[PDB]
């Protein structure tokens, strides 16, 4: 019924367990938060900010239309915001 | 007489560590305004 | 030795090839009336004016339908929720034009199916069984009630009950999606989970038991002959099966109690179908699926479409096209 | 794009004077439009009379022109038919009929400017969608 | 020997602790009634119709006549506060008695007092407790009568002049009317008891029900079951539970159809229009609009050949056209002024439609009971904007779900009660399997 | 190896999930994706 | 006793999560398919491939987030990170739909990994490999829908996007364009899925209500011992019950459990085949006899003709926003609409 690993119930009721994870768990939560609040997640993944979906007087989707020019096409759209 | 770091240990944190990080990021998102 | 007691003894006899029972006394006639009317109408009924607009829809084989397109067509929108037995029509010709057979069939069937569920309790008691198989069957019965009675009640007309046909069934689903966005409703989502999961677990339990059959046969014979009807020992090795499945995932994610396992098998699809039956029944009162149309806008206020807005475009095309001659005013309120 | 002041600049009267609302007013107007008006005028249409919408071009051809703050503020007080021939306060919410339309009861003069402004700003953001109907959803 | 998950089944033969459970649970119900009203009142805004505000308890109090005047306009919110506070306070008393009897009080009552102790198999004691509660129930229905006839009356949506609170001086006593309702078919244009359409019939039926319940109480206190009743039922706690589960289920389905169709004891002023009502109001709205423009709505042929605004029902009555032909059984105070002996009167339509009727129709058409789970009002293809789901949709769907599950509970507990009483709810005796002692089917 | 009672860990983690889920549900009504 | 056997020893050790040779394939790919989907639905848009928001970061909820398919202009490009389209730029790769192929391909190899795992564990534990065989049905569905179907069309764009509402849109597309409900191969799949659910419920119900009394508690679960030799419920009583209730009943435990494997597995395989046909627009769209009659006889109407009108509505109202690269512009006057609506 057992293969040698320490039982889960034995672990999460232990004091050493909660001494470490009371730090690691919030720290991870805070790190994730900061990835968003600093705006880093936008830049890493290329996701439009609420103000950068369209240019001001634009209602056309900036749709990729070329396979091998696709990279340059997105950068063209992005500069038409900057 | 229980090993701490095991294959099990790796499997678990492989899922747990990003799940909490993601949870924090998704939490922050709730306060974004347009 | 009294005539009435002999009759009671035969009705409840456990020796009849098919159990009759007191619920059977109502189920046998109502199911025969429904079945006989259904067969005849499916083959030879004339076109029915389902939507009350004098636009009769042809449902039967002899009027140019095949097995896939044929249906017994719901009764006229002019009738609404009014009772329309045969003796309320000036003639059978009138009764046929207005969709009278649909009411006869669905009422006799819902009764007979209701007594079908009670008959399952009844025999379980005569045989000294536990009583709850009928509770499992209440999930399909609730589903039939929803599409044939409950949804008609909420919308005010049997003309919006589910047609008794294959293409009619699809007509019903498409319109229900345009009108209630059922796909975005959590009780239908639970129903898909009950029905996918039930198919999954059916397959799993079938392959695990089949995988751990104890060798009792040669390769020239069907392994099925390694089981004899009524043998006392189990025909498969539940610990080998548990030992395989507990390693495929991990140990505690596998049953080794057969009673918990089979209860899980009963519970999962029964409950998911309860919900999907309840989904139809509550959308009958127009508490619809989640509406996320235009939920995302940008810093100026442009709508930023999501997949839900695409769904809505599809829904709109079903909406503007269904019952194309039947609406005089801009809102389809029922 | 964003809610720039050009977007928030709408005509005040027929004479041609303009007015620049704040983002606060715009959001206030949208909130009040939803409270007092959306049930009939969601998206800039009119569910109970689809022949009349809230497109700026439709308002402009109304008698009293209604494509300006004054025209709208006056309409919310003493509404008339499209040609100005008859007053319709008895079948349309207004301050004059707040006894029969109780939601107009607690609307202040600044509330009306906001509601009006939202109606004039929104076709600048959504274009054809405003007053277009399901075709543009 | 029940598992923790069937743990309340341990209370079956502990009449003391089982009393605590029941009384504490009664506390929860009274508490919710208290808390919810206060929550609704704190959120109430009188300038908005109730049905634009997610209210389900304030309308129940308004209907009893409290807090409202002509046309259903709220004139005094203090009666709402009182009902919630008193309910809230009372829940502590029930809570108190409930956790006392469940924790500290005697575990079983029959040793303490032969009056309050009971054996489930005591058919006489059981019918006496039934009788007590029957009398209480009968008193309950007479309180509604008392309020109606001696304490301000009730809200009358059909009152002349837009609806008003009205004291009821001539409740209907004629049993041909009162029990006539029990014998109308439940189908369209009949509607069984859901069709009750005036407060005289409502008050009168409660006189009857009140008397019949008081009559049945004493009956069941003075009698014990006859042998035909004794041979026909299972006499056990779980059986009695299953009987009431069936009754609660049946009652839940009726309540569902009641709040969905009936606009009398669920006034549309408070609850919003019904489905039929709202659909009728749309046809009315565009009849009024098109005829103001010059359309002769009586002679207008629609695309199908049927009249665009007006057609006949299958028995001949002039009714609204379009898909709302299905709803011609609808009757409402804003509509009936237009009906003559043949249905809708074309001369009344051309001449006698009032602005208040136009207002009402536009209002009900735009408040039809259609809306999304996240409370986006209107058809499923509507864009976000209107935050609205009719109280009638909320009240109909919730109680259909509850009614369905209690029918499943009836089946569950009825079959188990039968199996337990016969002695095989735990499985089949290997040494004595019935089928093994039966002849084979073939 | 057993100091913290299990039901304590269960209750607290339970309320931790409820908190985060309710934050996500609050967020459906505010900010992005609120329709407003 | 060289390095290969020392590795074999380690991979096949009885541990909390069995690894095995198949683990080398399964776990990396299963984890990265999963990780890609959670990453993309949290952080990645579909603005440039679809014109859709599709992440929590953008304001979407669990029902509307998706990892969407690449733009139609990518054709069937593998969209490798290092490939000619994204050219090693991770940001651009995300914006061009690279996570879709990343998930679909790593998912394909994970499903292989998982099925090899079922073979591997079955071999070591000594059981017959029927659970692996049954898993052929999920795999056939996955490859026919996610890979074979878009490969027959113009691009990956028309594969399903990995998300809840995006799959819903997939269902409705197949109704309006392929008339997929009319396909007999789908109908067989429906019968297999609903037949499986039925078999699942009816079998579990029957076992639980034909139990032997093997203990005294009112909880019947306790009274089963996983090593007992005896059947825990009566097959003889169950056969009688169903023979009398339904006319026929199972009498062979082995057949019954094989049938439960057979029914849903076959159903899924059948639906995979029809999707292969839809890869080629080889639909069962029409009945020719119906249309000939309908074209000549304006009073002829069936539920078949009514449903196509719906299909035509779906196509005209959803195509412009659903296929944006086609620049469909349908003026109001050309849209098919019934009266008033
Ligand atoms: C003991 C065992 C029982 C065995 C009994 C066997 C025979 C039972 C037959 C019941 C079948 C009922 C069909 C419902 C028909 C319908 O129109 O039912 C609705 C009617 C209400 O009728 C409507 O009633 C209306 C009354 O309003 C009228 O009057 C109002 C007055 O305010 C308004 O003015 C309104 O405008 C005006 O129309 C009109 O008459 C409508 O035309 C009419 O449709 O409700 C009703 O009579 C109330 C009762 C309906 C409850 C049943 C609902 C079905 C629940 C099935 C659950 C099964 C679950 C699955 C199980 C597994
Ligand atoms: C892990 C977490 C553990 C909990 C998980 C439990 C699983 C199920 C519960 C889901 C958990 C999410 C609930 C919180 C979100 C919520 O609901 O939040 C919604 C509201 C709070 O949100 C408010 O919701 C309102 C809903 O509109 C209501 O208010 C509007 C403005 O007044 C209008 O009046 C409108 O008509 C009226 O419907 C508005 O949208 C407000 O703007 C918004 O703030 O909470 C409510 O209402 C509170 C309702 C609680 C009682 C439930 C009543 C529902 C029973 C009727 C349904 C029967 C079943 C039908 C089956 C289908
Ligand atoms: C008046 C109503 C009533 C009463 C008094 C009983 C009483 C009883 N029932 Mg029955 N039951 C009822 C209605 C009722 N039931 C209904 C309507 C159904 C169908 C759904 C059932 C189905 C049922 C089954 C299947 C079984 C019982 C059993 C029992 C016994 C033990 C129950 C127990 O310990 O529960 C313990 C309580 C729980 C385990 C908690 C349940 C949690 C529910 C399911 C979730 C509810 C959450 C809610 C929907 C939303 C939550 C929101 C979130 C924030 C949390 C007891 C005698 C057992 C029995 O037969 O004993 C003899 C048994 O096996 N009941
Ligand atoms: C309305 C819900 C309800 C009610 C009233 C009861 C009531 C009861 N249950 Mg049941 N039960 C319920 C739901 C309910 N249960 C559910 C959902 C489950 C599944 C989780 C169970 C599972 C269950 C089991 C497994 C058992 C019971 C038992 C009991 C009885 C004794 C409990 C005891 O001694 O605990 C003692 C507990 C405490 C002392 C802890 C504190 C509890 C108090 C009362 C909290 C009160 C809080 C409140 C704010 C106080 C305000 C006071 C103020 C008004 C003055 C009691 C009559 C037992 C029984 O039958 O005994 C023979 C038993 O074995 N129940
Ligand atoms: C049983 C009848 C019933 C009915 C018809 C309603 C109906 C309503 N309530 Mg009330 N409510 C109830 C019970 C009920 N509630 C209970 C028991 C509580 C205590 C928790 C509340 C607490 C409550 C609050 C605090 C609020 C409401 C509000 C509302 C409105 C909007 C509801 C909504 O958006 O749900 C959203 C939908 C769901 C949550 C779906 C739940 C699905 C369940 C889990 C499935 C059921 C499984 C089985 C039982 C609506 C008029 C709101 C309102 O407008 O107030 C004026 C509001 O703020 N209600
Ligand atoms: C129907 C519910 C119910 C039932 C059957 C019982 C039954 C019993 N209780 Mg319990 N009890 C209840 C509710 C109930 N109680 C409540 C609600 C409370 C909190 C107030 C208590 C608090 C309580 C205590 C503290 C004790 C008992 C005791 C007893 C026993 C003897 C009581 C006696 O001699 O009567 C005495 C009777 C009276 C004084 C007459 C009271 C008549 C009332 C006031 C009229 C009816 C009230 C009405 C319905 C609601 C008020 C109106 C409101 C709506 C505005 C008996 C087994 C005793 C026991 O067993 O201890 C060993 C004991 O010590 N009970
Ligand atoms: C909650 C209320 C309640 C409950 C649970 C009981 C329970 C009981 N009563 Mg009592 N009874 C009550 C209220 C109640 N009664 C009231 C208020 C009165 C006064 C009129 C009576 C008058 C009364 C008498 C005169 C007798 C009983 C008897 C009995 C016992 C046998 C009942 C029986 O065979 O039913 C089974 C019912 C039938 C076999 C006949 C069913 C016929 C119905 C009306 C058909 C309805 C069909 C349809 C589906 C329902 C829709 C409504 C329809 C009428 C339109 C049982 C213990 C009997 C007994 O043994 O007394 C000691 C007896 O002789 N009761
Ligand atoms: C239904 C009960 C309505 C509500 C609530 C609101 N409006 Fe309305 N509006 C309605 C109708 C039936 C009409 C046409 C009446 C006629 O015969 O002309 C209107 C018209 C308007 C207009 C004029 C539109 C035009 O093109 O000229 C405006 C500017 C207008 N309505 C504004 C408005 C506002 C600001 C509201 C909230 C206070 C509002 N309406 C509510 C129906 C209904
Ligand atoms: C037995 C049991 C149980 C149960 C319990 C119960 C159910 C209870 C009840 C109880 C209750 C049921 C309670 C109640 C309470 C109440 C109270 C406590 C009250 C108070 C109130 C107040 C104090 C108020 C105040 C006020 C006023 C006066 C005015 C207005 C404002 C306010 C609101 C503030 C359980 C399951 C858990 C467990 C097991 C056992
Ligand atoms: C208030 C009111 C009113 C009145 C009412 C009344 C008058 C009622 C009555 C009612 C009643 C008077 C009812 C009754 C019922 C009954 C029932 C519901 C029955 C049941 C039955 C059963 C359940 C049985 C069963 C069985 C059988 C069949 C066989 C044998 C076995 C047994 C016994 C099980 C009106 C409407 C006017 C109006 C409004 C208000
Ligand atoms: C892509 C990519 C990658 C990878 C990545 C990954 C691997 C990721 C992962 C990630 C992850 C791994 C994530 C996670 C997440 C999680 C979450 C976000 C969760 C959530 C959940 C929740 C929300 C839940 C809740 C609940 C409910 C609702 C109910 C019941 C209870 C519970 C609590 C369960 C790499 C680097 C290779 C590179 C390339 C790209
Ligand atoms: O969905 Mn659309 O809504 Ca219910 O009615 Mn009005 O139209 Mn017609 O009769 Mn069948 O269908
Ligand atoms: Cl149609
Ligand atoms: Cl219409
Ligand atoms: Fe099995």
Author numbering:
A (entry chain E): 3 to 84
B (entry chain F): 12 to 45
C (entry chain A): 11 to 344
D (entry chain V): 1 to 137
E (entry chain C): 32 to 473
F (entry chain J): 5 to 40
G (entry chain D): 12 to 352
Q: What do the study authors state?
A:
Consistent with the high mobility observed for the W1 and W2 water ligands, the connection between D1-D170 and Ca appears to be weakened between 730 and 2,000 μs and is only fully restored at the S0 state (3F(200 ms)). This includes recovery of W20 in the O4 channel, which is proposed to be involved in proton release during the S0→S1 transition.
In natural photosynthesis, the light-driven splitting of water into electrons, protons and molecular oxygen forms the first step of the solar-to-chemical energy conversion process. The reaction takes place in photosystem II, where the Mn4CaO5 cluster first stores four oxidizing equivalents, the S0 to S4 intermediate states in the Kok cycle, sequentially generated by photochemical charge separations in the reaction center and then catalyzes the O–O bond formation chemistry. Here, we report room temperature snapshots by serial femtosecond X-ray crystallography to provide structural insights into the final reaction step of Kok’s photosynthetic water oxidation cycle, the S3→[S4]→S0 transition where O2 is formed and Kok’s water oxidation clock is reset. Our data reveal a complex sequence of events, which occur over micro- to milliseconds, comprising changes at the Mn4CaO5 cluster, its ligands and water pathways as well as controlled proton release through the hydrogen-bonding network of the Cl1 channel.
